[PDB]
Amino acid sequence: GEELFTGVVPILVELDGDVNGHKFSVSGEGEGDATYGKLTLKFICTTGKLPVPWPTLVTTLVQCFSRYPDHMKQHDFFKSAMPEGYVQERTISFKDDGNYKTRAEVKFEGDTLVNRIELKGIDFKEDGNILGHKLEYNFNSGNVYITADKQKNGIKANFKIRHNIEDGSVQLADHYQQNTPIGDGPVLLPDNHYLSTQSALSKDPNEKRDHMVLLEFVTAAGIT
Numbered sequence: 001g002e003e004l005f006t007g008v009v010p011i012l013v014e015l016d017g018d019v020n021g022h023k024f025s026v027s028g029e030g031e032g033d034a035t036y037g038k039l040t041l042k043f044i045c046t047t048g049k050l051p052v053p054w055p056t057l058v059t060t061l062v063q064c065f066s067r068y069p070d071h072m073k074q075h076d077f078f079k080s081a082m083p084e085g086y087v088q089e090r091t092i093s094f095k096d097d098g099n100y101k102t103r104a105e106v107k108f109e110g111d112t113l114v115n116r117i118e119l120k121g122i123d124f125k126e127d128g129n130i131l132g133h134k135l136e137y138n139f140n141s142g143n144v145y146i147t148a149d150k151q152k153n154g155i156k157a158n159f160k161i162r163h164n165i166e167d168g169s170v171q172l173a174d175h176y177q178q179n180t181p182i183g184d185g186p187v188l189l190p191d192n193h194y195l196s197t198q199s200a201l202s203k204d205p206n207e208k209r210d211h212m213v214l215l216e217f218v219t220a221a222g223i224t
């Protein structure tokens, strides 16, 4: 699967979500260049106004574009599952608030890497930082800690995202993640390691739709 990522790969993202009964959809398009751990995407809410803050969707909205250093190539599960793909499931628990449960299939459709997601959010506070839109439009750098899940022929990840609240505080979003291959072939089961991420959120000045432009760089580290 790593062979599929030596060049620039078009990406499509499609999400359907329901947060406390507020249904919405997001479509994204862009490209990835895993050689450089680089992603550039534009996401649009196709149903109107997004009912949650864009930063809370960043992690849900293709870790196969991570740059794995040559010395860690044997630990890249994500590319090894391609093209048939993988299922990526998360529970994202927002401290003192609700949670998202996500299910995604990440796979090739022809030359395009597609991330198709269903998101369900429950138990959110109408006056909280998420439904109340009190989060800043930015995204902090962080680490994603990966371990093998041999019994499921996949991986698990754990990490904490810290969303900045407008008043100066932070909204923690605890992430628990499981990935399992869709095809019945072999994959790479990694040693413990992490992914180091940085992300820049912007706007398209001519876009009147509710949207997010995202530039992300991700690099694997942790094994020498």
Ligand SMILES: [Zn+2]
Binding pocket: 021, 022, 023, 051
């Ligand atoms: Zn609504």
Ligand SMILES: [Zn+2]
Binding pocket: 058, 059, 061, 062, 216
């Ligand atoms: Zn990301």
Ligand SMILES: [Zn+2]
Binding pocket: 133, 134, 135, 166
């Ligand atoms: Zn505000």
Ligand SMILES: [Zn+2]
Binding pocket: 136, 164, 165, 166, 167, 168
């Ligand atoms: Zn601030």
